[PDB]
Amino acid sequence: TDPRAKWVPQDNDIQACDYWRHCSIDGNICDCSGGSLTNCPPGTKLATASWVASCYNPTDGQSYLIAYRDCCGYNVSGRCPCLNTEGELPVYRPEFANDIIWCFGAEDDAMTYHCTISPIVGKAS
Amino acid sequence: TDPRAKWVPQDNDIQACDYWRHCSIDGNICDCSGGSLTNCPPGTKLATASWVASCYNPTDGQSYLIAYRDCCGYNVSGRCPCLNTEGELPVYRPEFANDIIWCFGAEDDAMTYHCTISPIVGKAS
Amino acid sequence: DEPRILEAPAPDARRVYVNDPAHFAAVTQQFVIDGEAGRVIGMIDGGFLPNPVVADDGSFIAHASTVFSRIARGERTDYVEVFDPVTLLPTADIELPDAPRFLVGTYPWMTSLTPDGKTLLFYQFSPAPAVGVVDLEGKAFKRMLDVPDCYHIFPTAPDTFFMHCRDGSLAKVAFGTEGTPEITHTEVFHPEDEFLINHPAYSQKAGRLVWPTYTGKIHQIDLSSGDAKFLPAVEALTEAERADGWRPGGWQQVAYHRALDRIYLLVDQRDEWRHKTASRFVVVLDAKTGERLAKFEMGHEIDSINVSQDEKPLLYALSTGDKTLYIHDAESGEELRSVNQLGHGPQVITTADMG
Amino acid sequence: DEPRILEAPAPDARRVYVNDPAHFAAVTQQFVIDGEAGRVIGMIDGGFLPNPVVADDGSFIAHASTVFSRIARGERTDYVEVFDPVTLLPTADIELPDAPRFLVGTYPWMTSLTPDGKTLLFYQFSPAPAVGVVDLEGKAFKRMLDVPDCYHIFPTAPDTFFMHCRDGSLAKVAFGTEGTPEITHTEVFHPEDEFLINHPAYSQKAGRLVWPTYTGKIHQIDLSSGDAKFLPAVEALTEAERADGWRPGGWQQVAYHRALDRIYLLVDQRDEWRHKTASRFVVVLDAKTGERLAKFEMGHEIDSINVSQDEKPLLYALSTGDKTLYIHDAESGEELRSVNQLGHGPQVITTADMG
C-alpha cells in the first residue's frame, strides 16, 4: 500500500507487482496478456537485450539474477502494470537501468514496448 | 447520476455533460481542450457537415437547433467526455445520428475525431 | 530457463474477442480471450475505429482499419489485415486506396464476410453510399459497388448480400464479379416511426437476422432461402413492463443463439431517449414463439452482450465503464468469472459459430 | 453562431506544457496550459516516447518523435516537428535518417536546443552513443557526432554542449569544425557510489546545472564561462532527516528558479530503492548558501515539479496517478488551482525562461 515502503517479495502470485522475480520490472507483466512468466505473447517479438537485477527468492532463501527482456512490436498491453526499482541505477549504468526500452535484438527491428518477462539467468553471488 | 434517468439540462456550466446545448453530443466538449462552446481548438480542422438535435434551453424555455460539428485532425482530447442522445435516431436517419464522425468538409481531409462544438443554428418548435 | 514466443491455443467455441474503440482514439486494441478459463490469450493492435471480423470456421481473423502518417493527421491509409489465429501474425495486408472506409462508432455489420470466407465487404458512406469488395484469397481490393441509400451488409452467399434501406425495405444485392449489381427490394417491413437499432444480431449459418426496435419489438427475417422471408414480430417486453418504463438499451443489445433458437436482449428501466446507456438486466426468449424463458439480473452495468454458439453456451456481458468482460452461464444467468483491464472503452464482443 | 478555429493566446511566462508519455503507449499527447487561468489552451499529438523542447524566447516549440507504419510495427520513422506556438500548426517536419532516437522514459535533457534556437541536438544510445545535429533553420538533419560513454546533452553555445560520462566526469563537445568534434573532459566530480538522478535541472540562460543524487546531495556546476566550474555540494536534507528516512523520489525531482536563484526538491520518507515513487513534500533552498527557505506539504502524491521563471513564480506539481497538474504559489506553497484529465500517465512539465 504505502508505495514508499520497502519492497517485500512474495512467491504466490505471478501477476502481482510484489512477485519476487519482478524486483526491477518497469512496464507490464507479460503473463497478463497471453505470455507467461518467461515467454512472450503470440504475435510479439522477443528482444535479446535486457536490464538485470538480483532478486531475492523467499521460498529458497537465495538471490537470482533476473534478465528483464521486453516483448516488442505491439502497443503497451495495459494490463498488470508495475514499476519496481530494486538496485536500479541511473541511465549511465545502463545494465541496471530500467527506463530504457530493452527491445534490441527483437525480430523485424521491433522497438515498441508491449510487456516484459522475468527469466532467471543465474545465481547472484 | 442514474444514467438511465431522463436528461435534465442546466445553463450554468458549459463543461458539464448536462449543459443544455449538449443534448445530443457524442464525444468530448471542445471548451475543455482549448476551443470554446462554438469554436475549434487551435491546430484542429473544422468540419462542415454535422448531425443536429433540438435542445431545450431552460433559461428561456425555448428549443434551439444545435448543429454538432466536429473539430478534426487530432487524436481524441480525452477531456470532458459526454454522450447524450436526445432525439437521436439510427444510422439510417443520419442527419440525426451521433455515432458517425461528423468530420466531412474539414480542411486537409482531416477525419480523426478531437472534440465537438455546439453552435446554435436556429430555433426549434 | 529459455524464453520464446508462445502460440495461442487453437480456436474453439469458447474463444471470445473483445474490441476496444477507446472512445474514438487514433489507435485501438483487440483482446483475444479464452472464455472457459477467463484468461487473455493474445491481443491485436488496430488503428482508428476498425471493423473486426472473425471466420466462423476459425481459420482466420481480420479487420478493416485506418492509420495516418502523423498519428492523427497527414496521409491517410485504409487497409485490411488478415491474421493467423494461433500465431497472431498478419498473413495479408491489403491497401484500400482512396480512403473509402466509413468512420463510425463500431457496428459489426458494417464490415462482413461472405459465407465462404473468401470475400470481405465494407461500407462506404461518402462521397456516396457503396460497398467495397475485398478478395481475401487473391489478397486484393476489387472494386466499389454503387448502392442506394441503404445501410449494413448481411451476406447470404458468395455473391449476394442484404442491406437495410432508409425506406424500410431490405435491398438484395447480387454482385457477380464484373458489371453493375442487380439490386432488388423486398416489401417495406417497418414503419417510419419504428426505429431499428444499429446493432442487430445476424447468424450467417442460420440465415437469421434478429433486429429489435427502440421499444423491444423484435423483427426477425429469415434469409436462408436466398430470399427474405419475414417472420412474425415478437415483443420482448410486455405491455405492463413498457408502461413501467422498460426498454432495451446499450451498444450490442441483442444476441442470438443458433442451435437453441434463442434471443437475448439487454433491458432496464429508462427514459426513452437514454437508449445508449448500460442496462442491468437481460431477457431471454424463444425465437419461434416469443415466449419468455428468463430474465436475469446481471448485477453490473452492461453495455454489450454476446453468446458462445456451443451446446451449453456462455453469456458474455461487457461493461464499457468497468472495462471488464463478465462471463455468465447462459442458462442460469449466473456469473462464472470476469476479465478486467480491457483497454479504455471496450465495446464489441465477437464469437465464431464453429458448429 | 459562426464557428471558427481559435488561436492560442501569445506565449507568456505562465504558459506550461505537460507531456503524457502514457505509460509507453505508441501514441502520446502534450497539453499546453495557461498556468494563471488553470486552463488547457491547446494540445499537440506525438508518437512513441517523444522528446519535447520549448524555445526560451517563446518563438516556437518542437519535438523529436517516432511513428510506425502499422501502429506499433512496420516501418519506423523518426522525425522532428516544429510548431507555431499560437496556431499550433507544424512549420517543419524533418525526417531523421535511420531511426536514431533513443527510446527511453522521457528525460528532458536527452534532446535540447542550442541557445540561439537554431540547432536541435538529440541522443542516440545504441549501437553506440552519439549525438545527432538537426538544423532547424535550414530544415534538415546534418549529421551524427560520435561521443564517448556519456549521457544527457547540455548546450552552452551554438556549437558546444556538455554531457555527463560514466566515469564521473563531464565531457565538453565542441563541434562545427566539421569532421570530428573536439571532446574534452573535466575532472571527475562524483564517486562511483554517488548516483546522479536522470532528471537534473539545467538553466541554459544562467548556465547552471543542478544535479541531485539519490540521497538529496546536490552538485551544482557553473557553465557560464563556457567551461565547467564546480561548486561545493550542498545537502538538501539535514542529517536528522536523512537518519529518519527522508530522500528525494519521483520523476522530475528538482527544479531551479533562475532569477531567484532557488532550488526546489521533491522529498519524502522512503526506502532506499523506492526512488521513483511519488513524494508529498518539497524543500526549497537558497542556491548560494544551501540554506533551507521552506518545506512545503503538497497534500497530494507528486511525481514531477517545475516552476515558472518570472519574478513571482508558480510551482507546478504534477501527479501521474491523479493525471492532474496542481498549481501552487512558489513562495507560500499554497495550492491555487488544478487541471485534471491530463491524459493517461503525464510525467513531464516544461516552461520557458522568457525573462
Swiss-Prot record, chains A, B:
Disulfide bonds join C17-C82, C23-C55, C30-C115, C32-C80, C40-C71, C72-C103. There is a cross-link at W51-W102 (Tryptophan tryptophylquinone (Trp-Trp)). One of its GO terms (biological process) is amine metabolic process. GO terms for cellular component: outer membrane-bounded periplasmic space. Keywords: Disulfide bond, Electron transport, Oxidoreductase, Periplasm, Signal, Transport, TTQ. It is found in: Periplasm. Its main location: periplasm. The chain holds residues 64 to 188 of 188 of the full protein. The modification Tryptophylquinone is found at W51. This is Methylamine dehydrogenase light chain. Predicted to be exported by the Tat system. The position of the signal peptide cleavage has not been experimentally proven. Tryptophan tryptophylquinone (TTQ) is formed by oxidation of the indole ring of a tryptophan to form tryptophylquinone followed by covalent cross-linking with another tryptophan residue. Its cofactor is tryptophan tryptophylquinone residue. It comes from Paracoccus denitrificans. Its EC number is 1.4.9.1. Belongs to the aromatic amine dehydrogenase light chain family. The keyword Nucleotide-binding does not apply.
Swiss-Prot record, chains C, D:
SUPFAM superfamilies: YVTN repeat-like/Quinoprotein amine dehydrogenase. This is Methylamine dehydrogenase heavy chain. It is found in: Periplasm. Keywords: Disulfide bond, Electron transport, Oxidoreductase, Periplasm, Signal, Transport. GO terms for molecular function: aliphatic amine dehydrogenase activity; methylamine dehydrogenase (amicyanin) activity. Disulfide bonds join C150-C165. Methylamine dehydrogenase carries out the oxidation of methylamine. Electrons are passed from methylamine dehydrogenase to amicyanin. Tetramer of two light and two heavy chains. Its EC number is 1.4.9.1. It comes from the Bacteria. One of its GO terms (biological process) is methylamine metabolic process. The keyword Transcription regulation does not apply. It catalyses: 2 oxidized [amicyanin] + methylamine + H2O = 2 reduced [amicyanin] + formaldehyde + NH4(+) + 2 H(+). Pfam families: Me-amine-dh_H. Belongs to the aromatic amine dehydrogenase heavy chain family. It comes from Paracoccus denitrificans. GO terms for cellular component: periplasmic space. Coiled coil: none annotated. The keyword Signal applies. It is an enzyme of class 1 (oxidoreductase).
